[PDB]
Amino acid sequence: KQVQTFGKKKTAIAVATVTKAAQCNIRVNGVPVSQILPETLRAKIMEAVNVVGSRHFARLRIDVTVRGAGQVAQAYATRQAIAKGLVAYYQKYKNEVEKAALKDKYLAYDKYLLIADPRRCEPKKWGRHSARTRFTKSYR
Template sequence: MATVLTRPAAGTVQCFGRKKTAVAVAYTKPGRGLIKVNGVPIELIRPEILRLKAVAKGLVAYFQKYVDEAAKKEVKDIFSRYDRTLLVADPRRCEPKKFGGRGARARFQKSYR
């Protein structure tokens, strides 16, 4: 008897994207093919790099939930080779100001006479 392979029914996938303190939520479910980020259709999102980030993270989340681990790793590697920032958050933050100067590193000018 032949074994029939069936794919699991695709359900919903939710993924998050962060930049500094902002968080965007993308929620996908079976339906008409609309993708929304924070309730806004993805076609309206500007700049284009943010649209690409949303789609990239959504694809990786889908592969993690509904497809095998090897396929997820392969998709992740492809995105990482293209642009690592599509999947990884930027950890840079503003450095706090310290005393003795106008900013974080700048010091007030010193005079000896």
Template structure:
């Protein structure tokens, strides 16, 4: 996460990961607009994914109307991407507002909003169909 100050405008770049999805969020002062891959958040077709993405903004209330957020995300499925975007936005908002109140609010609501989720898929083993499934044995 880095911070750039140019012409007295604060810009925060943050990232979030979930499974194989990686999201990068750029947060600037604005009027409350959110774009994901250059598409406004209102036009995301999956309702559950949209609610996951907008959770951090709903939690901070009126502060959300003071920033514009642009997110680029790739990899994984649409729910994994939504969680990665959620993490990137939450981390960026904590850094942008530099407030312990916002950080404690996010941690109290869901600690994975800031820390991420370390679970990954288990790799497939040789001689099997998948990570754990083995060949069936027949004794008759």
């Protein structure tokens, strides 16, 4: 039993491959979760899984391939694709009731879940550097 979802935030896309387990501790890339070098980002990725059952619903084997932005945005993207995968699994193989329980509690707890946070970038324009602070003034 499988589903495959994606995270998207900034220019990082994550790809969450779900393959049926009823145990497996969740991991990322080539480095699992206890060996993720930035402790802070590790903690972010934890709150995804930890909340809404620590290993009570989080029992699927979920590994990811995340590329396309710096370390921080990849960790964000990770959380998203994980929780997406759980939800979609509990949609197909299991009733809407269980999904509604899980989902509602995700939505509540400040990520939102649903949002890609799709605020990207600015263009550089004119005759001007970034958004305005110009060169610096001539007298007026």
